[PDB]
Amino acid sequence: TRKKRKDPDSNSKENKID
Amino acid sequence: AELPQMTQQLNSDDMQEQLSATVKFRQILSREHRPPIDVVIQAGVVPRLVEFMRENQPEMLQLEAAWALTNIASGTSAQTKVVVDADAVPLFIQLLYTGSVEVKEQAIWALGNVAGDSTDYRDYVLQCNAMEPILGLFNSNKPSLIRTATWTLSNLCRGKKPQPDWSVVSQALPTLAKLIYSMDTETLVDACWAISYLSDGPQEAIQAVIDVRIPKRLVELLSHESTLVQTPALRAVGNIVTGNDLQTQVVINAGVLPALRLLLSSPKENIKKEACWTISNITAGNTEQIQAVIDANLIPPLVKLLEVAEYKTKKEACWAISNASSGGLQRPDIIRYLVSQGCIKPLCDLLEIADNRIIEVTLDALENILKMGEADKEARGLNINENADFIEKAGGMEKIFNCQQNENDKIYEKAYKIIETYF
Secondary structure, three states, X not given: OOOOOOOOOOXXXXXXXX | OOOOOOOOOOOOOXXXXXXXXXXXXXXXXXXXXXXXXXXXXXXXXXXXXXXXXXXXOOHHHHHHHHHHHHHHHOOOHHHHHHHHHXXXXXXXXXXXXXXXXXXXXHHHHHHHHHHOOOHHHHHHHHHOOOHHHHHHHHHOOOHHHHHHHHHHHHHHHOOOOOOOOHHHHHHHHHHHHHHOOOOOHHHHHHHHHHHHHHOOOOHHHHHHHHHOOHHHHHHHHOOOOOHHHHHHHHHHHHXXXXXXXXXXXXXXXXXXXXXXXXXXXXXXXXXXXXXXXXXXXXXXXXXXXXXXXXXXXXXXXXXXXXXXXXHHHHHHHHHHHHHHHHHHHOOHHHHHHHHHOOOHHHHHHHOOOOOHHHHHHHHHHHHHXXXXXXXXXXXXXXXXXXXXHHHHHXXXXXXXXXXXXXXXXXOOHHHHHHHHHHO
16 A cells, blocks of 8 residues: 555643633 | 832732732733733833742742733743743743642643743743653642643644654653543543644654553544544544554554544544544555455445545545555455445546545556456456446546646646556
């Protein structure tokens, strides 16, 4: 076979409002 | 800026009015939305807030200060830079083991915002030796602390250009191996995302994920009630099977193929898409691994997706089938099965809507099917290639030679080589 593909063809900042 | 007696009382030596001022700043920075970080920054109170995080400052003062600085760091990159330039990061890290549990959650939250800003600040946090105190947080029991620490941990593993210091972030693998057994859903999600980041790299990185017994649990998490857990778990599984055949076999042995079958009928389109991508990486293996995919009854739902699914999913199903077809040289029964499952027409139909790259992928699949056809009719002494008939009867023979009009100089040769050799 013929490959592999590392890639196929979360939420950086959050605020604390409690 | 302007403030007296709220900046002055912040600069006061009276510990009570130090707290009263800090609370005010915190409540302001706690954005219901849209919060006035800039006017707080230019008020010149940031260096003072950083001082309140020093080792033997009052606990409630450390808490409110770290909370305030957390929200400032949650803003724009320039606003996050203000916190960093005030040398707050080394103090955030110290609070991870010196402060109380409540103080720890504030500090680890802030580090998450700093690390999540850029690869530079991500690396900077790691360079300040944050990993050891962060991993120490998971010795604690409080779910909210574990949850936030896992989020920050994922931020430290995220990013590829450049990737984080492997010798540092790989130390979190034994911790992440436990975290994916958590009962907390949000903890599960971020832990799986962190693993997907670490598993994205060379075979050494993949092997490290394997060696801590992670893949077994990942496959189990593919059937989690939440698609928020399934997606990063699938991404991680997909990353592992980008390694060698040995590493790919581990995932198969963990029972990934039946799990992938269920994911092919997932409500989320991108889960379908990356399920096909994962299978395509497995079908990209040796003969026996292609056979395993066949024996797991994965081809019929793949063929079905190859004809009716959205293009982004359809193109991944193409890869899976196109790969598996290459295996037909060593085992012609693979081609026979693929053809019998009706893959030829969906492949041919794809030729007229696909990218320049997918068309090339499809043409290789069709060529492998054709090449097997001639090899069989020659060995059995026949005058007609039925696979060539199957393509023609499917009306793809024309589509094969509607791709030489395409201006790419190499969608061109295979297209007419197919016509010159088989038609």
